[PDB]
Design a protein around this ligand. Sequence first.
Ligand SMILES: [Cl-]
Ligand SMILES: [Cl-]
Ligand SMILES: [Cl-]
Ligand SMILES: [Cl-]
Ligand SMILES: [Mg+2]
Ligand SMILES: [Zn+2]
Ligand SMILES: [Zn+2]
Ligand SMILES: [Zn+2]
Lengths: 166, 166, 166
Amino acid sequence: LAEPEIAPTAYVHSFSNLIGDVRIKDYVHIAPGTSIRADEGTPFHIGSRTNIQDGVVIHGLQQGRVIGDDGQEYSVWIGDNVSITHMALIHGPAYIGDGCFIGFRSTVFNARVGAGCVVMMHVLIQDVEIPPGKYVPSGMVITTQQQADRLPNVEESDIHFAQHVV
Amino acid sequence: LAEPEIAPTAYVHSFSNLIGDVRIKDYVHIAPGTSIRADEGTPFHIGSRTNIQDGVVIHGLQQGRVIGDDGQEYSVWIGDNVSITHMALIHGPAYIGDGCFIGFRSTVFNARVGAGCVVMMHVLIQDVEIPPGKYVPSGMVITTQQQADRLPNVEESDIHFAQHVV
Amino acid sequence: LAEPEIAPTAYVHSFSNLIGDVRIKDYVHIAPGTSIRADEGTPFHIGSRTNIQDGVVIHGLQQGRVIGDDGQEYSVWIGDNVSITHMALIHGPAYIGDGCFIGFRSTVFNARVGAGCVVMMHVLIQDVEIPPGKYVPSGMVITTQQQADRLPNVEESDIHFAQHVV
Ligand SMILES: [Cl-]
Ligand SMILES: [Cl-]
Ligand SMILES: [Cl-]
Ligand SMILES: [Cl-]
Ligand SMILES: [Mg+2]
Ligand SMILES: [Zn+2]
Ligand SMILES: [Zn+2]
Ligand SMILES: [Zn+2]
C-alpha cells in the first residue's frame, strides 16, 4: 500500500492504526484507539483541524468513490474543522463536508453529508445526500433520500451544543 | 485457557486479540482491531471463509451454550461464509448460520440467527430465534420472539446489497 | 498528567489504555480493549468491584463536572458494583451510582444515573438525571428529562436479567 501523507503539524497518536493512502492535513488530531485504514477503499482525505476521537473506525469499500474538493476520487473525504467523535463509523464511499459535527456512535456510509451539518448521537446515515447545514437528532436512522429531505436546518442552539462538545 | 485452533489458510491479523478455545476454519479473515476471547464462555467456532471486521467484539457468558453443527456445545458458533462487519457485537450464547450478513454496529446476543439472514445496520437481536432467510432492516430492536416471527424474507435486492458490501 | 491510583486488589489488563487521574478502587476488573483516559476531563472514579468490559470507552469533556460521593468534582464517577458492559460509552460529565447495570452499546453522557438502575442494550442517556432504581428498555433514546421521568421501576425480572449477564 501507499504510505500516509501526514502534515507536519498533524498529531497522530502512536496507538492509532493508520495505514495506506490517507492524506492528513494541518493541525489534525487523531486520538489513540482509532482505526483509519485505506487498505480496501483508497485514498482517504482528512482536512485541516479535524479531530478523530477514540473508538472511531474509518474504512472503505474497494469499489465506490466520492469526488473530493480537489476533483480527485476518494473512498472517504472528511473536510476541514470536522469532529468525528467517539465510536463513529465513517465507511467509504463517504463525503463529510467542512465544519460538520458527527456525534457519538454515529455512522456515515455510502453517503454525502454537506458542510456545516450537526449530526447527533446514535444516528445512522446511509445511502443518502444530506444538504449543507442540516441537523440530525439523536437516534435517527436515515436510509432514504425522502427522510434526508425532511431534516431541519441547524439552529443556533445546535451549533452551541456542538461547540460545547468539541 | 486452551489455545486457538487456526486453520492453515486462515488469516488472523497480529492486532487481533484472539484468546482461548476459538476454532477457526479455512480461509477465515480476521481484521486488526478485533477482539475474539473465549475466556469466559467457551468454545467458539468461526466457519470457513468468514470475515470478522475491524471494531468487532466476540465474547460469551460463562453459562449458556448453543449446539454447533458438529453437535458440540459452543458459547459462540458462527458458520461458513458469514460477514461479521464493523463494530458488530456477537455475544454468546449465540449461533449465526451459514451465509449470514451481520451489518455495521449490530448485536446478536442470546440468540440464534438462521442461515442466509441479512441483518442490516444498527440492529439489536437478543433473546430470539430468527429462522433462515430473513431480512432485518436497519435500526430494528428485536427482543421478543413475536417481533422475530414478523420479519420479512430476504429478497434479491437484500442479497445484492449484502454482496455489494462484502 | 497525574497517574492513575490503582487499588492493590484491582485488575487492569495490560491492553487497557488507562491514563491520567483515574481513581480505581478495590477488586475492580478492567478488561483488555478498554480506553479510560482522563486526559481532558479529570478526575475519574471507578468504585469497588466494578467491571469495565472489552470495547468500552470512558472519556470526559474538559469542562463540566459531577459531585462524587466524597464531595469532590469528577468528570466521570462510576460507583461500586457497577457493570459497564461491552461497547458502552461513558462520557463525562457523568455520574453512575452504585449497583447500576449499563448494557451493551449504551451511552451515558452529561447525565446522572441513580443507584440501582438497569439500563439495557443500545440505549442513549444524555442531558438528564435518572432517579435510583429505574429500568431503561433496549433501544431507548433518552435526551429529555420528561422521558427520564416516565421510566419504570426496576422489577425483580430486570435484576435477574442483569445478574444473569454479569
Ligand atoms: Cl479522544
Ligand atoms: Cl458501537
Ligand atoms: Cl476490516
Ligand atoms: Cl470483557
Ligand atoms: Mg475498539
Ligand atoms: Zn470495511
Ligand atoms: Zn462479555
Ligand atoms: Zn471525548
